[PDB]
Structure formats: C-alpha cells, structure tokens
Amino acid sequence: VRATYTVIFKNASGLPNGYDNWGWGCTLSYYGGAMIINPQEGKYGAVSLKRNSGSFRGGSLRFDMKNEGKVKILVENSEAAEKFEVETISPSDEYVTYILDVDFDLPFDRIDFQDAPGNGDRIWIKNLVHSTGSADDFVDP
Numbered sequence: 001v002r003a004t005y006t007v008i009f010k011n012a013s014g015l016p017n018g019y020d021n022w023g024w025g026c027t028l029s030y031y032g033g034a035m036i037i038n039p040q041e042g043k044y045g046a047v048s049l050k051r052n053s054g055s056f057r058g059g060s061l062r063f064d065m066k067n068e069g070k071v072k073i074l075v076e077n078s079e080a081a082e083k084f085e086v087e088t089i090s091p092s093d094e095y096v097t098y099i100l101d102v103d104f105d106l107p108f109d110r111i112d113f114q115d116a117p118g119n120g121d122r123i124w125i126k127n128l129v130h131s132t133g134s135a136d137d138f139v140d141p
C-alpha cells in the first residue's frame, strides 16, 4: 500500500533542485517559505514546474494553497506535448491542503498552477509533494 513521497517544494525561497520554471504571464517570488505567483491581468499566467530529469506517473499531488481567484491545476508531458486539467480550485483567503488524484494516462514532467480567470489574482503555494499512490491513501508525511 506504501507509496513513494517526492517532496518537491517545502520552506524554500527559490526553485526546487532539478526543476525549471516553464511558466508564462507571471512574476514568481517567495516569502516565508511560500512560492508566490503574481500573474498579469489578461495573460492567464501560470507557474509550470518542469522536472528536468524523469517523470511522475499517476498518483496524487498534495500542496497547501491560498489564492485570490480560481486556480487551475494541470500536468503535462513535454515529450508528447500534451496537457491534462486535474482540477480548478475556488478562491481562499487562508491556506488549504489539497490532495488531488492525477488521472492523466501519460507520465508527467510539468506541474502547472494557473490563473484561470486571467484577472491577475495571486497564488501562494507551500508544501508540494507527489505520491505514487492515491489521494485516499496519502499519509501526509
């Protein structure tokens, strides 16, 4: 039942080791351990964390987020040039923990957090972890 838990981002102030930002339409900054996305109005901006070597398969994504507007979570396979919409998350003025199943049928090497409405609403992310297992089985490590 045991999963493998990949800690991508926790209490950092820069990009994760082995990840690039393939984002668009935004400024990325940090404060107090949170990644802060400042999207430009009209650009539908996003951070896109690109894993430089290897890929994840299925499993689940866990993260804390607060967000002024609706945020779309996607994964992508850069080799196939395919993207997959995981969930759109409603606004919250406080951090909330999300644990989302990833049902994409390909491996993924990009994880995206996008300003879905394109109004420039800011996004804060902490504590980003992938599990090889399901969201229902995720034991938050």
Ligand SMILES: OC[C@H]1O[C@@H](O[C@H]2[C@H](O)[C@H](O)[C@H](O[C@H]3[C@H](O)[C@H](O)[C@H](O[C@H]4[C@H](O)[C@H](O)[C@H](O[C@H]5[C@H](O)[C@H](O)[C@H](O)O[C@@H]5CO)O[C@@H]4CO)O[C@@H]3CO)O[C@@H]2CO)[C@@H](O)[C@@H](O)[C@@H]1O
Residues within 6 Å of the ligand: 021, 022, 023, 024, 043, 044, 045, 046, 048, 072, 074, 076, 081, 083, 112, 114, 115, 116, 117
């Ligand atoms: O960084 C160097 C690296 O870049 C490589 O090229 C990358 C490029 O940098 C970007 O990462 C690009 O990313 C694109 C995504 O793959 C995906 O296609 C994405 O699709 C967006 C779309 O553009 C738009 O924002 C859309 O907004 C919706 C919104 O979500 C909502 O539904 C609203 O109602 O409507 C709007 C408008 O339709 O949302 C889509 C999903 O997120 O667009 C990204 C930006 O273009 O990928 C490139 C690779 O293909 C290479 O140059 C590489 O060599 C280099 O090293």
